[PDB]
Amino acid sequence: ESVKEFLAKAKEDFLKKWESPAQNTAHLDQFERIKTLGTGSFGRVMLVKHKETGNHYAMKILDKQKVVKLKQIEHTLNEKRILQAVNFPFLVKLEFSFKDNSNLYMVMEYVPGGEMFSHLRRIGRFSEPHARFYAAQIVLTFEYLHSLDLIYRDLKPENLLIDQQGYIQVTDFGFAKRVKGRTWTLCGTPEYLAPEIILSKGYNKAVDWWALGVLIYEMAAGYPPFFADQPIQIYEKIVSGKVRFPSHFSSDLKDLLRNLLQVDLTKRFGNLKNGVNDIKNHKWFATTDWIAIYQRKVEAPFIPKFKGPGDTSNFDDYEEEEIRVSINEKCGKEFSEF
Amino acid sequence: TTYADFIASGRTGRRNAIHD
Numbered sequence: 554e555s556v557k558e559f560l561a562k563a564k565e566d567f568l569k570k571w572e573s574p575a576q577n578t579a580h581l582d583q584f585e586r587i588k589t590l591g592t593g594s595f596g597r598v599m600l601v602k603h604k605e606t607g608n609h610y611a612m613k614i615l616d617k618q619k620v621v622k623l624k625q626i627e628h629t630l631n632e633k634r635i636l637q638a639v640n641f642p643f644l645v646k647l648e649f650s651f652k653d654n655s656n657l658y659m660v661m662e663y664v665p666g667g668e669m670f671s672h673l674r675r676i677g678r679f680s681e682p683h684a685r686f687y688a689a690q691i692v693l694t695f696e697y698l699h700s701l702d703l704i705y706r707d708l709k710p711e712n713l714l715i716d717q718q719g720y721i722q723v724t725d726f727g728f729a730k731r732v733k734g735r736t737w738t739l740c741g742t743p744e745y746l747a748p749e750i751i752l753s754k755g756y757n758k759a760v761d762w763w764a765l766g767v768l769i770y771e772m773a774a775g776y777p778p779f780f781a782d783q784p785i786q787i788y789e790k791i792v793s794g795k796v797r798f799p800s801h802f803s804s805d806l807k808d809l810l811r812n813l814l815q816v817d818l819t820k821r822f823g824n825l826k827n828g829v830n831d832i833k834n835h836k837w838f839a840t841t842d843w844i845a846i847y848q849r850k851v852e853a854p855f856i857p858k859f860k861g862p863g864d865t866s867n868f869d870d871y872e873e874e875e876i877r878v879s880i881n882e883k884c885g886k887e888f889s890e891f
Numbered sequence: 892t893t894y895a896d897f898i899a900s901g902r903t904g905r906r907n908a909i910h911d
């Protein structure tokens with residue numbers, strides 16, 4: 554019960570930051586903008602250099618007016634409150650946050666190895682030991698998050714960054730939520746949605762363990778267990794729940810996946826009386842040393858190739874856009890707590 | 892093959908979240 558003891562003290566540290574969140578800890582002028590590392594409906598993430606220390610960071614920029622328009626105000630306040638409060642080896646660190654007239658800014662530690670998504674698509678698929686190495690890190694991270702009553706709700710390779718030592722850093726807490734009961738928001742990514750989300754049932758932390766099943770499948774197969782050209786067709790496949798496995802999947806992997814990709818909440822691993830230990834003690838994880846993983850003592854199966862200090866070869870190229878800061882404050886009352 | 896079907900699909904790039 555030293556996991557039990559680690560988590561008790563983890564919670565005391567989280568709650569102190571949760572109740573008194575850090576706010577307005579830098580300013581845009583302290584950073585020089587270098588390159589856009591990512592951009593989509595989720596916002597825009599730029600490599601920046603902190604002028605006074607020269608440190609490199611990844612700065613997420615959110616347009617306040619666009620957040621309001623997408624009705625993502627509360628989710629955005631969730632994300633910053635939660636991310637500034639957590640502390641775990643596989644969660645990206647939030648170093649500073651601030652806002653100006655037009656934008657919200659979250660300055661995170663820069664993870665130079667790129668997105669797992671990039672390497673997975675290029676390489677095709679990961680071998681089972683390679684996928685097991687990443688999966689173990691997610692299992693420990695969800696154990697940590699869920700003990701704080703946090704639901705993550707957006708696991709996918711696009712949100713997992715690879716650091717210089719080959720370990721995972723989870724990013725994007727846009728859908729993360731602290732909740733003790735059930736919740737109802739339809740959010741996530743189509744391929745990763747648990748059936749109870751699609752069926753508008755009210756759901757809990759068990760949806761994260763379903764998403765882990767999708768991730769492990771996608772890493773080991775090279776494609777997700779439910780895909781189609783349009784989301785409506787993906788949802789139909791998810792709710793029937795019939796998974797076919799590639800012929801090269803081991804017998805243990807298939808058995809773990811049948812228990813994670815389980816429509817019946819009374820049988821889904823992670824959700825039962827034994828909690829996460831049904832997963833940690835499964836046969837597929839028998840060669841996994843959970844303490845060595847946490848301590849980062851396991852040699853990683855893949856090490857990113859990294860040349861410079863702000864080298865960005867592991868990220869795609871995007872059209873650089875201006876960072877326009879209006880002359881008037883926008884949505885002041887909505888984001889007062891940011 | 893399933894792999895061939897995936898690669899020919901429209902969802903091999905980065906996938907956007909839904910918030911519906």
Ligand SMILES: NCCNC(=O)C1=CN(c2ncnc3nc[nH]c23)CCS1
Binds near residue numbers: 591595611665
């Ligand atoms: N829903 C998809 C979310 N995507 C991202 O959050 C992005 C993160 N990127 C980052 N790159 C390097 N270090 C970082 N630290 C935090 N984020 C970092 C760039 C790729 S896109």
